[PDB]
Amino acid sequence: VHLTDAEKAAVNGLWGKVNPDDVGGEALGRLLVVYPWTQRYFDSFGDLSSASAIMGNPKVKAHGKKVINAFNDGLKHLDNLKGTFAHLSELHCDKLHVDPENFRLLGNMIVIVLGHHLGKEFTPCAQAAFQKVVAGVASALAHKY
Amino acid sequence: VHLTDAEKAAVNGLWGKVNPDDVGGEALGRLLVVYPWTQRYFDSFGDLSSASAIMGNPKVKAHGKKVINAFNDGLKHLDNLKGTFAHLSELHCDKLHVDPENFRLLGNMIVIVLGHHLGKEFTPCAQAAFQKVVAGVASALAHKY
Amino acid sequence: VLSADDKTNIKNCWGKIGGHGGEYGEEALQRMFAAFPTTKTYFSHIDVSPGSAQVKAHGKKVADALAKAADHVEDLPGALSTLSDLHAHKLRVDPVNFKFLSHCLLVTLACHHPGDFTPAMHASLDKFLASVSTVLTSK
Amino acid sequence: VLSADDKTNIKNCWGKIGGHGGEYGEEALQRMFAAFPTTKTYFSHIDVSPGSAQVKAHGKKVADALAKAADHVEDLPGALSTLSDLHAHKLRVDPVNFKFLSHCLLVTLACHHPGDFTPAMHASLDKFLASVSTVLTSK
Ligand code: HEM
Ligand code: HEM
Ligand code: HEM
Ligand code: HEM
């Protein structure tokens, strides 16, 4: 991860004005709708039968908060993405058996909820800064396979 | 990388009876035929217009030797796949811009040339030992993105 | 696959982009060249700096093939076969690259249409650009 | 895409596996369960230990759908739509998994047919199992 100074202030500044709780529940929300094989991994969240069922579902929102707080960690400790995510990488490998391709997929869901959310402030410059982080956060969760 | 003892003797024993020079030129050979977008990356090897053109081609064979000797390193230094491949990962990223998915693809070409080559000695047990190595060798070459 | 719901979701969307398709396709490219500079390699022959005139021209051309596809939703190999020999055969574009441009196209639409860019819509749209990506790499 | 060369390469191959298809499909599965144990998850309900009787039964069933496809090469959605709702809709199998089984199927054929498993052949075969994978995940 590079993350230059003007590339650093774009991230923490634009992250400034998103509600993290909704970014998380909505990204997790969208992922399951756009990629329905991801529902199998979350068999424990009740039914997920339609676009509605998987959006009012309190358990999806709840999980997507635990997701966003870890992502918030990412930002705090960009020195060591791998250290921060050592435990969680182990979890998603030894006990969940999630193919790493699924990480960049969710990464992308955060990427476009941010754009959906922030409007014409999610400039190509802003996006790129976020790309490198979500990319960094993705291979962080993969280094234990 | 796990690589248990009976999983270690399967690798160095079966690698025992392959000609590395042909495994390398043939895996590189097959990759370009089965995945033709990989030819763009090797624009410098003359024409690659057909199955023949890309198999008698001395430059393909030549490159596939340099590939196999690095793979041989992998085997020698399974303690540190990442250290061994630090330089080469940098090369394939900063100067070649190769999408990491292409690594597991070539990995696979070695995987089945080995099977094609060794016959009914490439047992499911043998394959698995080789999977973990070629997999290990693949994310080794990816850790600099 | 594309249901009747997918078919009609698409047409509403391209009904709404109207004549912005051009500047959208520009933005999507501009977004790809920065978030995924690996792609810049395919355009060594043109100026590519953020705001630009050759990026603008290619931009419009892209969104036209998107308009075309949306029209012939049911005959995508048919409608886009001339862009198949260009990408798959002539240029040898990596099949991973189409996932980067399709994504940046979604970030573009999502940015410009918060009201319309719902989950239900967004799946159809993804799915759509996946078969547009598929046919594009079909050879 | 599949050319006439691809169509006929396939039929020769399935012409040559004859009635080994069954034991081949078994071997391919046995090869998948070991090289990619992530897959074992999808078969929690059966015995899966190296040599086995339920792995043998599923094995044959697989190779039948491969025989079927090879016959209806030109109507793959048609020939295999009943296996689409099984995998895509009922089981929610990851689309990455089909790349692991297709590979192990190639290691199986390559092992048993060194004479026939040439580069030219092997591309058609890969390409074939890619559209068999595609249709399988088509929903
Ligand atoms: C994008 C990066 C990801 C982050 C930051 C993340 C974060 C987390 C965290 C923090 C937990 C533990 C919750 C707790 O401590 O209470 C968790 C659990 C879990 N994650 Fe992820 N995750 C990511 C990717 C994924 C993806 C793509 C999947 C889809 C397969 C997934 C599937 C699961 C499952 C099945 C659990 C446990 C189930 C449960 O809590 O009921 N994760 N995740
Ligand atoms: C499977 C793991 C791989 C290994 C072990 C490997 C090995 C090597 C080595 C050792 C060199 C330098 C040769 C020298 O020092 O003279 C090299 C160069 C190169 N590799 Fe790889 N490589 C791998 C994957 C790939 C893949 C998948 C591609 C396809 C995009 C690729 C494309 C290239 C190119 C374009 C060069 C330089 C071109 C040239 O030498 O003329 N590599 N590789
Ligand atoms: C799936 C969405 C895409 C569409 C609808 C599309 C469509 C087009 C169109 C309309 C043209 C110009 C037609 C012509 O002048 O012949 C073109 C050219 C081209 N495309 Fe794309 N394309 C897509 C994806 C991509 C991707 C992902 C790449 C790789 C980054 C790519 C690389 C190129 C290149 C290198 C040219 C020629 C450049 C030039 O005009 O000099 N295309 N494409
Ligand atoms: C592309 C090649 C494949 C073919 C031709 C194929 C075909 C079949 C056939 C013929 C059946 C049994 C039909 C029935 O009894 O209804 C079946 C069942 C099943 N398949 Fe596959 N399949 C393929 C790939 C996969 C993959 C990659 C997976 C995931 C690892 C998978 C998971 C399953 C499961 C879980 C069942 C039901 C198990 C049972 O019989 O109790 N399939 N498939």
Coordinates of C-alpha atoms in Angstrom, one line a residue, chain D:
Chain D
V1 CA -17.3 -20.2 -28.9
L2 CA -16.3 -23.8 -30.0
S3 CA -15.3 -24.2 -33.7
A4 CA -16.0 -27.2 -35.8
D5 CA -12.5 -28.4 -34.7
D6 CA -13.6 -28.0 -31.1
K7 CA -16.9 -29.8 -31.7
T8 CA -15.1 -32.8 -33.3
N9 CA -12.2 -32.9 -30.8
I10 CA -14.7 -33.3 -28.0
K11 CA -16.6 -36.2 -29.7
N12 CA -13.4 -38.1 -30.4
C13 CA -12.4 -37.8 -26.7
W14 CA -15.8 -38.9 -25.4
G15 CA -15.7 -41.5 -28.1
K16 CA -12.4 -42.8 -26.5
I17 CA -13.4 -42.7 -22.8
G18 CA -16.2 -45.1 -23.8
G19 CA -17.5 -46.7 -20.5
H20 CA -14.6 -45.4 -18.4
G21 CA -16.5 -42.1 -18.1
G22 CA -17.9 -43.5 -14.8
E23 CA -14.6 -44.4 -13.2
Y24 CA -13.0 -41.2 -14.6
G25 CA -15.7 -39.0 -13.0
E26 CA -15.0 -40.9 -9.8
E27 CA -11.2 -40.2 -10.1
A28 CA -11.9 -36.5 -10.9
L29 CA -14.0 -36.2 -7.7
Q30 CA -11.5 -38.1 -5.6
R31 CA -8.8 -35.7 -7.1
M32 CA -10.9 -32.7 -6.2
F33 CA -11.7 -33.8 -2.6
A34 CA -7.9 -34.0 -1.9
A35 CA -6.3 -31.1 -3.9
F36 CA -9.2 -28.8 -2.9
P37 CA -10.7 -30.0 0.4
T38 CA -12.7 -26.8 0.5
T39 CA -15.1 -28.7 -1.8
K40 CA -15.8 -31.6 0.7
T41 CA -18.1 -29.1 2.4
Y42 CA -20.7 -29.6 -0.4
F43 CA -20.8 -33.3 0.3
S44 CA -21.2 -33.4 4.1
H45 CA -24.0 -36.0 3.7
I46 CA -22.0 -38.8 2.2
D47 CA -18.8 -40.9 2.9
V48 CA -16.0 -39.4 0.9
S49 CA -12.9 -41.4 2.1
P50 CA -10.5 -42.1 -0.9
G51 CA -12.0 -45.4 -2.1
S52 CA -15.8 -45.3 -1.6
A53 CA -19.2 -46.4 -2.8
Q54 CA -21.2 -43.2 -2.7
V55 CA -18.4 -41.3 -4.4
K56 CA -18.6 -44.1 -7.0
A57 CA -22.4 -43.5 -7.6
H58 CA -22.1 -39.7 -7.8
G59 CA -19.0 -40.2 -10.1
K60 CA -21.0 -42.1 -12.7
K61 CA -23.9 -39.5 -12.6
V62 CA -21.4 -36.7 -13.3
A63 CA -19.8 -38.4 -16.4
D64 CA -23.4 -39.0 -17.7
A65 CA -24.1 -35.3 -17.8
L66 CA -20.7 -35.0 -19.6
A67 CA -21.8 -37.6 -22.1
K68 CA -25.1 -35.8 -22.5
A69 CA -23.5 -32.4 -23.1
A70 CA -21.0 -33.8 -25.6
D71 CA -24.0 -35.1 -27.5
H72 CA -26.0 -31.9 -27.4
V73 CA -22.8 -29.8 -27.8
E74 CA -25.0 -27.2 -29.6
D75 CA -27.8 -26.9 -27.1
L76 CA -26.0 -26.9 -23.7
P77 CA -28.5 -24.7 -21.8
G78 CA -31.2 -27.0 -23.2
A79 CA -29.4 -30.3 -22.3
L80 CA -28.4 -29.3 -18.8
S81 CA -31.1 -26.9 -17.5
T82 CA -32.2 -29.4 -14.8
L83 CA -28.6 -29.3 -13.4
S84 CA -28.8 -25.5 -13.4
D85 CA -31.5 -25.2 -10.8
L86 CA -29.8 -27.9 -8.8
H87 CA -26.4 -26.0 -8.5
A88 CA -27.2 -22.3 -9.0
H89 CA -30.6 -22.2 -7.3
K90 CA -30.8 -25.1 -4.7
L91 CA -27.2 -25.6 -3.5
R92 CA -25.6 -22.2 -4.1
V93 CA -22.3 -23.6 -5.2
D94 CA -19.5 -21.0 -5.5
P95 CA -18.7 -20.3 -9.1
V96 CA -15.0 -20.8 -8.3
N97 CA -15.6 -24.5 -7.4
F98 CA -16.4 -25.5 -11.1
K99 CA -12.8 -24.4 -12.0
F100 CA -11.4 -26.9 -9.5
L101 CA -13.5 -29.9 -10.8
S102 CA -12.9 -29.0 -14.4
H103 CA -9.2 -29.0 -13.7
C104 CA -9.2 -32.3 -11.9
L105 CA -11.2 -33.8 -14.8
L106 CA -8.4 -32.6 -17.1
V107 CA -5.7 -34.2 -14.9
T108 CA -7.7 -37.4 -15.1
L109 CA -8.0 -37.5 -18.9
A110 CA -4.4 -36.3 -19.3
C111 CA -3.3 -39.1 -17.0
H112 CA -5.2 -41.8 -18.8
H113 CA -4.7 -40.7 -22.4
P114 CA -1.2 -39.4 -23.0
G115 CA -1.4 -40.0 -26.8
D116 CA -4.6 -38.0 -27.3
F117 CA -4.1 -35.3 -24.7
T118 CA -2.3 -32.8 -27.0
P119 CA -2.3 -29.0 -26.6
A120 CA -4.9 -28.5 -29.5
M121 CA -7.2 -31.1 -27.9
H122 CA -6.7 -29.7 -24.4
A123 CA -7.8 -26.2 -25.2
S124 CA -11.1 -27.4 -26.7
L125 CA -11.6 -29.6 -23.6
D126 CA -10.9 -26.7 -21.2
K127 CA -13.2 -24.4 -23.3
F128 CA -15.9 -27.1 -23.3
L129 CA -15.9 -27.5 -19.5
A130 CA -15.9 -23.7 -19.2
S131 CA -19.3 -23.5 -21.0
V132 CA -20.5 -26.6 -19.1
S133 CA -19.4 -24.6 -16.0
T134 CA -21.0 -21.4 -17.4
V135 CA -24.5 -23.0 -18.1
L136 CA -24.2 -24.8 -14.7
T137 CA -23.9 -21.3 -13.0
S138 CA -26.2 -19.6 -15.6
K139 CA -29.0 -18.9 -13.1

